[PDB]
Amino acid sequence: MQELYLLGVVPSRRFEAVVNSLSKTLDGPKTILEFWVVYRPKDVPPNLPRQPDSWLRLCSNIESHDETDTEWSKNTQWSMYLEGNSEPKREDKCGIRPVNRAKLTNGSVTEFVEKMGYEFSHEYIIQGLEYFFFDTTVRIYQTLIPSQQRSIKPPFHPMNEEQPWILHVYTHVADASNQVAMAKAEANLTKVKTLLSAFCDLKNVRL
């Protein structure tokens, strides 16, 4: 599955303005709180696996459990994301990142991945808001490191002192091959980018 993306940066004071003012431009904010953990293939056969990029990461929604009690990785629903590197030679246009995902239930996700032979790498939290345009999302988030592994709600450790926020533009096309659908997603991304650019400047980057 192919995802077309733009992104940008937002300093801290500029964050609040970008937010309220985003609410003025496009469809209102949805609170998003995500917990992510990555895994790594232990075999590392150097010739063909290509484990540095293709290795997978998986995450899940923590809407309200951690504030109420100790977080329960068993209690929430989980989903697994395989997101590859971005396609180069795309300096001019919007970026393209192939992403595949699956929802997982009734199982020990952790034990399953490690029984695959994958193994822990890094664990980070995504917190922020996402806004909507027709068939194209846009989330402003921040990357909060947990206080601890499966950290509780009170701490919410932040990565840096400047605390910059990151701007992600979402568009999804099912079928890679179809040029018409890529064209319409491209133009949807252009139009949203134009409006968002009045708001604040953002552009295509690699991966």
Binding site: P45, L48, L56, M80, L104, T105, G107, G117
Partner: protein, 185 residues
């Protein structure tokens, strides 16, 4: 309620499905509900860890998939694509079951062929009996009906199967079906 799973490997049972359905509908007034298909796939990464996934078509939404023999989760078809893209897991090995579910008076049955790449024609039956939920009384009612409704060859062959039991769902657990494929290879 209480349902039985029966299974045949004789070659006569091979040719049997289509005339079996036809006779069933014609003579006992069966009604044809959804076609049944399920797909089993088996492969393992370069370090010899087994993984297998199978897909009931009835409740495809949840695809059940287990590592080696031990550990299993419910997951989405895209997960399977994930594992193909990672290439760390090796090449598939496919079984499949195709038939169709009928409802006949007081019970519903599934008549299906099992095969890999249209190899053979060993037949699986699955009869849920609406009623008592006492295994001991359903087992001979089911057995009686099965005999009656497929009696032409019934003298001629004997099954290998998993015993009937009682389970709330109207379709048989997917995990159990995995166990049937794994005892079948």
């Amino acid at each position: 309620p209480v349902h039985g799973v029966i299974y045949y490997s004789s070659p006569s049972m091979a040719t049997f499905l289509s005339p079996a359905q036809d006779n069933l509908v014609r003579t006992y007034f069966a009604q044809h509900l959804k076609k049944w298909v399920v797909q089993y796939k088996l492969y393992r990464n370069a370090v010899t860890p087994k993984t297998l996934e199978f897909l009931k078509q009835n409740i495809n939404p949840s695809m059940l998939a287990c590592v080696d023999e031990a550990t299993m989760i419910d997951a989405e078809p895209e997960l399977e694509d994930i594992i193909v893209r990672t290439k760390l897991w090796n090449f598939r090995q496919s079984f499949t079951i195709e038939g169709s579910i009928y409802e006949v008076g007081s019970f519903k049955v599934a008549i299906a062929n099992v095969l890999q790449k249209s190899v053979w024609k060993g037949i699986l039956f699955h009869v849920t009996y609406d009623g008592t939920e006492s295994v001991d009384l359903a087992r001979p009612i089911i057995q009686e009906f099965f005999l009656k409704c497929f009696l032409q060859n019934n003298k001629s062959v004997t099954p290998v199967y998993e015993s009937f039991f009682n389970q709330p769902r109207h379709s048989l657990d997917s995990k159990l079906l995995l166990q049937l494929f794994k005892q079948r290879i």
